């Protein structure tokens, strides 16, 4: 029946995927052994979306870990839930990527690609019918970015009628990890805009700022970021995992949420981000959550949505409140904040409430919007790419791999066209 | 100069072997380019102007 196949790429992708698996296992009541220790009702019927039916009721995960470094599988396996996955899916090579996109795509992307295609085709044939494929990776390296684009292209070529959703990590000039990071981001954007259905923006600096200034944590680490992104993913996927009154699915969003195929980027966000001392002093209501989901402070963007206009908005709720409050809130917001959304298209916010509350928290609601704020990131990426491609720095490595430089030129032309398109649709006037 | 030009003609027969490879090049490597060079140039105008 309707199942979702999950994919893994990049060390950060691997760790966030493991965190998501642990979070969903805890929420649905699964012991680290592999059996079932839940006590709910809807945690048995649609549990097969991410698991598989086996003897003795031992559900197995459905995720393929793709990596170029063997040191990642050892790290993720030693965890409390690393002994539950399929070791066959841990397809690792012998040579690392070295934060190179071209080298990994060519060298470590030819003789290793066949095995992961074989395992994913076996998994797809194992189920009856599927909807889409979820891949969580990062653009910071040659592992997630070099292989994710190739595998997405392969699966789209083989099975065009599937959902291509991903949650890659955007870079940031303030917080970097690779000197040639803008090169790899440049190379990845072309494949993302050419051979990907939808893509969501993930930033680490914004999450760090959010936790520091709102959560007020002592020693924030990558574990907190993985926890937050996993909670975001569960909030996104609860529309299908836990059906309620008004259920939705990934493709209905991706159709209603994307005006043009060349603009498929989104802006994801969670509402209740409070400090440890404020959990016992809070007022659970609609207007508070609307304000936290509308302001730019809770938003995990490393930019300002207020500089442009809102294009499409989706408010996904998870709780038992009402229906009237959401629509009245949206109506009055559109009435007052008239200079923040496209006037040519009214009713840009979608209503969605999940009647099944999450485990451990009664109230949850995730924000999936596509506001006019990413243009700053695109233009700065283009500017830095131009600056570094002017004198052709850090290029002899890619040249020594064998690929020519015309790919950089066609890519930069593509981003210039795309940023021109974004700025031209930014101030969408009614008439002349 | 005379013996080095006899040698330049010997290494020019070797460079003629290089040109013998060059006719495999100008038998197939531009045989493909006869079509794929033309169908890789026209549409820059499409992206450029319109």
């Amino acid at each position: 029946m309707r199942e979702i196949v999950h994919l893994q790429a990049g060390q950060c992708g691997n760790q966030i995927g493991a965190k998501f698996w642990e979070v969903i296992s805890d929420e649905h009541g699964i012991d680290p052994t592999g059996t079932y220790h839940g006590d709910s009702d809807l945690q048995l019927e649609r549990i097969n979306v991410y698991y598989n039916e086996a003897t003795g009721g031992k559900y197995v995960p459905r995720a393929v870990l793709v990596d170029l470094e063997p040191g990642t599988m050892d790290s993720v396996r030693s965890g409390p839930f690393g002994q539950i996955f399929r070791p066959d899916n841990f397809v690792f090579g012998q040579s690392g990527a070295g934060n190179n996109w071209a080298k990994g795509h060519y060298t470590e992307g030819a003789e290793l690609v066949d095995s992961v295609l074989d395992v994913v085709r076996k998994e797809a044939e194992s189920c009856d019918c599927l909807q889409g494929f979820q891949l969580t990776h990062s653009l910071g390296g040659g592992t997630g970015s070099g292989m994710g684009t190739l595998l997405i292209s392969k699966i789209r070529e083989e099975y065009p009628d599937r959902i291509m959703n991903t949650f890659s990590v955007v870079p940031s000039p303030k917080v970097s990890d690779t000197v040639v990071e803008p090169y790899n981001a440049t190379l990845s954007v072309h494949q993302l805009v050419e051979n990907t259905d939808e893509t969501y923006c993930i930033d680490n600096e914004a999450l760090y700022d959010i936790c520091f200034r709102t959560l007020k944590l002592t020693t924030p680490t990558y574990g907190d970021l993985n926890h937050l992104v996993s909670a975001t993913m569960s909030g996104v996927t609860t529309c299908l995992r836990f059906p309620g009154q008004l259920n939705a699915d990934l493709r209905k969003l991706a159709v209603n949420m994307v005006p043009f195929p060349r603009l498929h980027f989104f802006m994801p966000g969670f509402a209740p981000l409070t400090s440890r001392g404020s959990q016992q002093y809070r007022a659970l209501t609609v207007p508070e959550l609307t304000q936290q989901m509308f302001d730019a402070k809770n938003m995990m963007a490393a930019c300002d949505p207020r500089h442009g206009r809102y294009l499409t908005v989706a408010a996904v709720f998870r709780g038992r409140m009402s229906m009237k409050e959401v629509d009245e809130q949206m109506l009055n917001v559109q009435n007052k904040n008239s200079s923040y959304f496209v006037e040519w298209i009214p009713n840009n916010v979608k209503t969605a409430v999940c009647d099944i509350p999450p485990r451990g928290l009664k109230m949850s609601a995730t924000f999936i919007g596509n506001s006019t704020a990413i243009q700053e990131l695109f233009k700065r990426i283009s500017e830095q790419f131009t600056a570094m491609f002017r004198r052709k720095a850090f290029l002899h490595w890619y040249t020594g791999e064998g690929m020519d430089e015309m790919e950089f030129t066609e890519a930069e032309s593509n981003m210039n066209d795309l940023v021109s398109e974004y700025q031209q649709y930014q101030d969408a006037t009614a008439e002349e | 100069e005379k013996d080095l030009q006899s040698k330049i003609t010997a290494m020019l027969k070797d460079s003629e072997n290089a040109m013998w490879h060059i006719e495999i090049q100008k038998g197939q490597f531009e045989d493909v380019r006869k079509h794929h060079e033309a169908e890789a140039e026209a549409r820059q105008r499409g992206l450029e102007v319109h």
């Binding site: 064998g402 020519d404 | 460079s15 290089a18 060059i22 090049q25």
Partner: peptide, 25 residues
Amino acid sequence: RKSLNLLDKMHEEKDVFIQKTKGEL
């Protein structure tokens, strides 16, 4: 492809060698 890039690169280097040989001869 870059084994496809060898297609152009090898014959272009051979053309450069043709220039060198013509000059030297």
